[PDB]
Amino acid sequence: VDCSEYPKPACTQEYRPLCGSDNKTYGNKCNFCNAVVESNGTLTLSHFGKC
Amino acid sequence: ISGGDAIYSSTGRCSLGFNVRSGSTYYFLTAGHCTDGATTWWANSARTTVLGTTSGSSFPNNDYGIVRYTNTTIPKDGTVGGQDITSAANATVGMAVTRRGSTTGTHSGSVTALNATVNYGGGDVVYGMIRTNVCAEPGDSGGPLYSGTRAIGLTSGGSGNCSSGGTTFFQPVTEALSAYGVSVY
């Protein structure tokens, strides 16, 4: 996962979780990538799957 | 299994929108972004209870898909959680609506606009969507949007979350019923 093309005004809502560097489980790549932007590039991917 | 319950495909989890049928054949509706590239569907994470196989999928442009039940025994309630659904109807601005999804459960709100275009990026653009101020979170895709005993739509996507508030766009259910020639029961 590369979030360059983010942000996105909306995300579909299927569930395929990713684990963020904030120990938060992000429900999908779109959700995660929008959070990276919102973090101003400080949030990163820990691993794929639930935290 | 009923509207709002979890559905699992090879790729991830979505939610069942509505149970429908044509003649003696039973199917279920869900989001097309969920049925896209999915074949088989199961009722649990374990993939041990088979529900059926994808019969149609319309995404992007629209956002509806339909799965044909292959499981004979599983009960097929024409409900949404235990709420009976007896008809389908068109959405209207200021209409009070309710959504149920497998991740967040049931949340309510209003229809704020019609015919919205939603750009999910990468060429994935959907049109003719119902905008509402109801929140939705990952796993809630394809769940029902209803009003009373009226089927209204299928969760497609949006932004924000249930804690702070958000915006969710739904696919009008009528359009899906019409395309497949099925009906709510």
User: What residue has token string 């999915």?
Assistant: B38
CATH 2.40.10.10 holds for B78-172 = yes
What are the phi and psi torsion angles at A12 (to 5°)?
Answer: -70, 165
Is residue B107 flagged as an active site residue?
Answer: no
Q: CB of B66 within 8 Å of any CB in chain A?
A: no
Do the two domains B1-77+173-185 and B78-172 of this chain adopt the same fold?
yes
CB contact under 8 A, A10 and B119: yes
CATH architecture of B1-77+173-185: Beta Barrel (2.40)
Resolution as reported, in Å: 1.8
Query: Measured between alpha carbons, how far is B142 from B145 in angstroms, rounded to an integer?
Result: 9
Is the CB of residue A20 less than 8 Å from the CB of residue A33?
no
Give me Rg for the CA atoms of chain B.
Answer: 15
Interface test with A, best of B64, B137, B168 (most A CBs within 10 A): B137
Is residue B2 flagged as an active site residue?
Answer: no
CB contact under 8 A, A14 and B31: yes
Query: Measured between alpha carbons, how far is B113 from B130 in angstroms, rounded to an integer?
Result: 6
DSSP code for B87: E
Query: Measured between alpha carbons, how far is B69 from B42 in angstroms, rounded to an integer?
Result: 10
Q: Which residue from B minimizes the CA distance to A25?
A: B138
Query: Measured between alpha carbons, how far is B152 from B17 in angstroms, rounded to an integer?
Result: 10
CATH for A37:
3.30.60.30
Query: Measured between alpha carbons, how far is B121 from B103 in angstroms, rounded to an integer?
Result: 24
Catalytic one among B2, B141, B147, B156?
B141
Give the type of residue at B148: G
Is the CB of residue B51 less than 8 Å from the CB of residue B74?
yes
Is the CB of residue B114 less than 8 Å from the CB of residue B93?
yes
3-state secondary structure string across chain A: CCCCCCCCCCEECCECCEEECCCCEECCHHHHHHHHHHCCCCCCEEEECCC
Close Cβ partners of B144 (under 8 Å, ≥ 6 residues apart): B3, B4, B17, B18, B80, B85, B99, B100, B151, B152, B153, B154, B155, B173
Catalytic one among B63, B102, B147, B156?
B63
Residues of B in contact with A5 (CB under 8 A): 121-122
Method: X-ray
Q: Which residues pair with A18 in a beta bridge?
A: A26, A48
Number of domains in chain A: 1
Q: Which residues pair with A12 in a beta bridge?
A: B157
Is the CB of residue B30 less than 8 Å from the CB of residue A12?
no
Range of the domain at A30: 1-51
Q: CB of B30 within 8 Å of any CB in chain A?
A: no
Query: CA torsion, points B143, B59, A26, A36, in degrees to nearest 10?
Result: -140
DSSP code for B9: -
Query: Measured between alpha carbons, how far is A25 from B168 in angstroms, rounded to an integer?
Result: 21
| Domain chopping of chain B, boundaries | 1-77+173-185, 78-172
Peptide bond into B60 cis (omega under 30): yes
Is the CB of residue B137 less than 8 Å from the CB of residue A14?
no
Query: Measured between alpha carbons, how far is B29 from B18 in angstroms, rounded to an integer?
Result: 5
Helix (H) or strand (E) holding B34: helix B32-35
Per-residue b or e along B144-170, where b marks 16 or more CB atoms closer than 10 Å to that residue's CB: bbbbbebbbbbbbbbbeebeeebbbbb
Query: Measured between alpha carbons, how far is B6 from B20 in angstroms, rounded to an integer?
Result: 17
Per-residue b or e along B18-41, where b marks 16 or more CB atoms closer than 10 Å to that residue's CB: bbbbeeeebbbbbbbbbbbebeeb
3-state helix, strand, coil in chain B (%, to 5): 5, 55, 40
